[PDB]
Design a binder for this molecule. Structure first.
Ligand SMILES: Nc1ncnc2c1ncn2[C@@H]1O[C@H](COP(=O)(O)OP(=O)(O)O)[C@@H](O)[C@H]1O
Ligand SMILES: Nc1ncnc2c1ncn2[C@@H]1O[C@H](COP(=O)(O)OP(=O)(O)O)[C@@H](O)[C@H]1O
Lengths: 809, 809
């Protein structure tokens, strides 16, 4: 326990501060949301691998630093662990250099007790691989297959591959911080992992950070109020990095007397204005920017985050100017372990990477943007998600004084057309390219802030599919849909803001969109309060939404009260889907009130899998009689029995009824309803379709059911009847109906266990020039060899129809 | 759970019927006797391999079919298993064709979800390898040693070897149906198996089957009564296959008006008469029989169960005649999977195999029967157990009209001599050939039904050893022993019919057998009711049984009452053995009553290990005095102490006593009985032998014991005394007796721990021309190197004796 105490004390001094203010002081709690969560037990469960997902600047880099100092005081994991090893991927040089040297280099200059005594018990070491996205070089998916020898690997790729696969040291605890875009590489290597998402700051947390940052509270409230006054900056301060930048810029200009919350349109504006405040006291510089942007170019082109002294002089800098750049945090990143250089944050290097593409040494901007645009997704050059974003933002001539007139409009205008061309290229890309997602493009599109450009750029969006996670994700999407005049089908994806104070802003966009026709909100956890504000927006005049799908939503009975209102007011809804909702007979009782109103004109309606009984049939029958606009009504999967169908059918036998479709799949059925169904078929005269499946229809019921179908003036075109208990003894009646009735088009009898004699009873009746012309479904039916070939030859005899049996898949 | 439901439904339709009547209707319970049993739990215990033993036609083939349909409804093994695979060994072509293709071919034509998703978890698949006896080709004991690769084996022998050994798929559940003759191949491959024997129908079950078969119950009782009237057919209807054949033949002739239960002598008669009813409506045919018998010949010669279209035309058939053969079940076996052909049952193919050997294309009957008779047991050509049986039966010119006069008597007469010669060849075979067992020959001999032929054929049976299992096994043996006039020693083996209604028929045979002398009923579970009927038969005059052995039988005290009766009546018993029976002092009290009767003359008597005490010694002493015929009495292993011996000896010291032998091995003994034993030795004058061993004889007892032996007029010839606690201090007295008494012949002192000085005390006394001439046992005694060689040289000096010490084994 000698060196164990020394190592534990050694970590305390190194990580006391982040390279000034105590880390124990300014640190605040982050949203440790467990992706399918106490800071105590990331490793309580026998899962021995944890991965952290977080966007750039969300605080992954220093979350581990707080975790390791918090360990060093014994407050976190004092029992299962007494050794912690920090693996900074930024400093890692993995191109055939490193051995297990990671262990000696971390502890102390060169002691080797732990290299032998500590490696013995594997439950004593975990590895904190910070920033796997910040890996440098070409990381092939598979390098160094055979790797088990302990002390000698000598290959950086082997070390990372083996340690992740837990082959170098079996039973090894891991906790790695990865950017969410990098999970594609992880999925090749992860084996039974645990995924945790890292969010940012809350409104209360933002106020706490400002108090913990501003020493003089007299202006802290004034600065916070100025920050709180802005609506875009405040919601952009969920990322802690932005809070640091706005605080530094305000405090840097505090000696000058300026503010920051005026040019807070997008991410480019706040960083460019920071660079304004980063250079307004300071200032040649563009060449120094050229010296570093090109250094930041090949630093992402060839993946060189760290900067050498020779590289510093290679592009051409001044040590005093570098120190001037150091002293007030341009990059200010000099490693204490050895004399190297780095940028302050990842977005700053990528911000200057886009600066090179707009200034006017390895890839020219105009010609090599196109190869970059197709190199955008390739991990070989890292990920350039922010590279284009700042490039997209910067061309909009941000209102900063000396960030407009030192760059050239000739390239920027050419860039605008190239970016506009690229958006269409990605939009028309049929293949499901994961990295240039529609949401990611909207992030760049929101960064435009140009009204006419986004109008023409987004006009290449016929179908919009959006998944949302954060509050900022709502505003970026809101700015797009508010001026998309060519959108036809739209959808939303929620995974978290469902309160009416948040979804109202986005939902208000839909009501004011003329081109919008379809809304797909299915498979979401949108609750009743969220549903209530949706109906408020739908009542707005001019809402051209026609068809909405609300399947699998968390809707309950009390939501139907609002839906009855929009039907009684809006006449644009034509198709409404409420399948898979836990609304009882009371919900239909409220819903049927709105449908009975003569103002509404609804044609289609889905109530599949809704918790319903025979009681709702009485209420729904009234609508079926008076609602002239109701044509199709798929009410299958419900628990209503034969009693409910009798009530529904007795009102559906009116010759003036408009019910042209009806589905009763898997609903409790017997042979009694066949008599009622027979009566409506001969009297309705326009029941074009009728779907039955999975029922318990009486074996004798078909005899009663066909009694009504044999009536001349019936126009049933499609009949589906599967999984019903049938026997070959009644198969004769099926043949009689098939030959007699000419209205039928396609009839399917799926997996209905009937004798092979009845199948051959159909062979001649089809050969007798019958009236079944479209399809005949007999799938999931097994016959012998001599029976199977008999149906095959009839296919060629009658090419006008297509018999559907299942000898294959 | 998509394809799992489809597969489960797929099995239901395929196996609903056995290629007409519902399998759910006519199926009835079979005797699922567990060989060392609910249909619920064959696989409850962690044993992961089950093998089923059953004779041909007992129902192994369709027992699995019922099991798999019963599974398909979820009634059997719904939890541990959801996938069942049927491996029909008849259809298996194992000569370097098959891959894992067994899995795709069974499910559906060609889907491959289960080939990848289902093979993952081995606790999801079991294999139903039906009829391992029906394997075709040369099955070597060891083919394909290395076999672990999953998807590619390509060798049929490798697949069967690996799957049985559970190497292709570790942790695999197996349930295989095998004919009992085939266990020799199984024992090479089985690893921790579970064996279950399958019996047939009961009398009540036979009645139930007739009711379930005959639609019109008016004649079902009449047909059953006609069946029940026959005594051989009814007991032959324990096999379900025979029930099917007799029912079909009666129903086939029901349109004609004939019966079946008149030519029911043997298995050949019922099948030949079935073939009569199989051809009386039909009928050229012999050539068609020649076309199929030769096809059935090379189908067992080269092991080709399945018949090809080319093979059908190769021998020469007619498709209409084949269809005529199909339509009323000659073989009627066309596979639904593919257009092949097969025989209806295994015995039918082997019945026609013997038909070729009696008609007049690959093995001539007369010359190649002899090679067949030595190829009878070789598994290379399958097993020909039924081939000879029908051949043995058919030569007896069965009373069928057109089954006598189309065949040639010239070959049949030559066959008779060859079969008669073969029986002697197998009878004189000293080696323990397992397959041509004595019981199996009697099965063929019973099928003769020829009085004079079986007389001369069985005259080559000096010793008869029979093991019986079923009721039919009793009648086949009964028909043999009833006319065996040269039997000397006979034995029975029971493993199940012990009720007096069954064993009486066989036991009545023994009483009427003149040549019979010895009966060995030892090591059986023959109870008192079975013992009671045995004594009833023994009282029959003319019973020439002299010596009976009844060791390890389940006899109790109440059986001795019957045994006392046969002794008081029959004067032929000379040797009676009752060793290892749980009969108390009361049993001897009843037994001694019969022995005291002057009519009985019993010489030898064994009461070893019987639960006895000193009380029985008083009763047994009276017999020892009055029973003049009693000479030897081995009453060792009993719990009687020294007190009992005193009572027994005090009556045994009479000079007129005839007790020439007496054994008291392991009975509780002390030094007190030596005085009584000394008194009898000097007075009895004819106690030739006296055996002692494992006692607690007093160390000083030998001094008292030798006191009587030193008397001149004593004629003790053999004395055995082992395991008695002895010391070298008394070893001097042993030497004095050895030199003095001239009556002793062989004296053994086994493992009696005495000093090496006493052994050398005997070295000189033997060298002094002593009177010990036959043997001197000193086994289980350990001496040093210089002591061991001293006894070795004395062996060559005196070749007239053989010292018995144990330096080796
Ligand atoms: N919990 C926190 N409290 C205060 N500031 C934070 C916190 N987390 C991150 N930061 C700010 O983020 C900056 C560093 O971000 P970093 O963790 O390096 O981002 P990344 O994880 O993407 O590399 C620091 O300047 C720091 O001020
Ligand atoms: N439980 C049963 N009930 C009725 N018949 C049976 C039963 N078991 C077997 N059978 C009869 O046996 C015949 C098939 O025998 P099989 O099982 O093929 O014999 P093996 O198992 O020796 O191949 C069928 O014709 C059937 O009538």
């Amino acid at each position: 326990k000698d060196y164990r105490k020394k190592y534990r004390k050694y970590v305390r001094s190194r990580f006391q501060c982040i390279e000034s203010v105590s880390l124990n002081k300014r640190y605040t709690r982050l949203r440790l949301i467990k992706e399918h969560f106490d800071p105590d037990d990331e490793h309580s469960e026998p899962v021995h691998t944890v991965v952290f997902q977080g966007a750039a600047g969300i605080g992954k880099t220093i979350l581990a630093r707080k975790m390791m100092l918090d360990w060093a005081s014994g407050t976190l994991y004092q029992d299962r662990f007494d050794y912690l090893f920090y693996i900074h991927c930024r400093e890692v040089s993995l191109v055939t250099q490193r051995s297990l040297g990671d262990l000696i280099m971390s502890c102390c200059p060169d002691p080797n007790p732990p290299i032998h005594k500590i490696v013995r018990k594997p439950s004593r070491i975990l590895f904190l691989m910070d920033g796997f996205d910040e890996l440098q070089g070409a990381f092939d998916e598979h390098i160094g297959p055979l790797c088990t020898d302990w002390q000698k690997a000598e290959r950086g790729d082997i070390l990372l591959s083996s340690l992740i696969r837990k082959k170098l040291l079996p039973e090894a605890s891991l906790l790695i911080t990865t950017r969410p875009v990098a999970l594609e590489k992880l999925q090749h290597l992860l084996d039974h992992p645990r995924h945790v998402e890292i969010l940012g700051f809350s409104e209360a947390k933002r106020k706490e950070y400002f108090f913990k940052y501003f020493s003089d509270e007299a202006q802290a409230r004034a600065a916070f109020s100025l920050i709180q006054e802005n609506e875009v900056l405040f919601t952009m301060c969920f990322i802690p990095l932005v809070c640091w930048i706005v605080c530094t810029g305000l405090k840097q200009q505090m000696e000058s007397g300026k503010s920051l919350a005026q040019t807070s349109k997008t991410t480019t504006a706040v960083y460019v204005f920071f660079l304004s405040s980063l250079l307004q006291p300071r200032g040649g510089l563009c060449a120094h920017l050229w010296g570093l942007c090109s250094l930041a170019a090949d630093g992402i082109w060839n993946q060189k985050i760290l900067f050498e002294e020779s590289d510093l002089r290679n592009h051409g800098l001044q040590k005093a100017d570098v120190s001037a750049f150091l002293r007030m945090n341009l990059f200010q990143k000099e490693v204490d372990c050895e004399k190297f250089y780095s940028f302050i944050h990842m977005t700053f290097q990528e911000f200057f990477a886009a600066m090179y593409y707009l200034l006017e040494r390895l890839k020219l901007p105009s010609r090599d943007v196109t190869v970059l645009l197709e190199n955008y997704g390739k991990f070989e050059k890292g990920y350039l998600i922010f590279v284009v974003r700042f490039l997209f933002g910067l061309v909009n001539q941000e209102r900063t004084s000396y960030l407009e007139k030192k760059l050239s409009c000739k390239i920027s205008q050419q860039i605008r057309l190239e970016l506009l061309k690229w958006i269409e290229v990605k939009a028309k890309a049929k293949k499901l390219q994961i990295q240039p997602s529609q949401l990611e493009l909207f992030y760049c599109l929101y960064e435009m802030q140009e009204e006419d450009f986004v109008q023409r750029a987004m006009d290449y969006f016929p179908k919009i599919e959006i998944n949302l996670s954060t509050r900022m994700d709502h505003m970026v999407s809101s700015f797009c849909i508010e001026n998309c005049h060519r959108v036809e089908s739209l959808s939303l994806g929620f995974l978290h803001h469902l309160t009416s104070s948040f979804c109202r802003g986005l939902f208000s966009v839909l009501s004011t969109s003329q081109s919008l026709t379809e809304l797909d909100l299915s498979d979401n956890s949108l609750g009743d309060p969220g549903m209530r504000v949706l109906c408020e927006t739908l009542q707005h005049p001019g809402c051209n939404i026609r068809r909405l799908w609300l399947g699998r939503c968390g809707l309950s009975h009390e939501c139907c009260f609002d839906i009855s209102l929009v039907l009684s007011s809006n006449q644009k809804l034509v198709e409404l889907d409420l399948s898979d909702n836990a609304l009882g007979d009371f919900g239909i009782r409220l819903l049927c009130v709105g449908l009975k109103h003569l103002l509404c004109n609804l044609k289609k309606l889905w109530l599949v899998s809704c918790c319903l009984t025979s009681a709702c049939c009485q209420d729904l029958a009234s609508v079926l009689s008076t609602s002239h606009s109701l044509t199709r009504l798929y009410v299958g999967e419900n628990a209503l029995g034969d009693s409910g169908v009798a009530i529904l059918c007795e009102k559906a036998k009116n010759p003036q009824c408009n019910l042209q479709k009806l589905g009763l799949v898997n609903s409790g059925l017997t042979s009694v309803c066949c008599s009622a169904l027979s009566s409506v078929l001969s009297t309705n005269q326009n029941l074009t379709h009728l779907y039955l499946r999975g029922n318990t229809l009486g074996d004798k019921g078909i005899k009663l059911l066909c009694e009504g179908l044999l009536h001349p003036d019936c126009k049933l075109q499609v009949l589906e009847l599967d999984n019903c208990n049938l026997t070959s003894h009644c198969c004769w009646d099926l043949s009689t109906l098939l030959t007699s009735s000419q209205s039928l088009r396609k009839l399917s009898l799926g997996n209905n266990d009937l004798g092979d004699l009845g199948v051959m009873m159909f062979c001649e009746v089809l050969k007798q020039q019958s009236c079944l012309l479209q399809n005949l479904g007999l799938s999931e039916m097994y016959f012998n060899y001599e029976t199977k070939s008999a149906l095959e030859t009839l296919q060629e005899e009658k090419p006008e129809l297509t018999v559907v049996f299942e000898p294959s898949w």
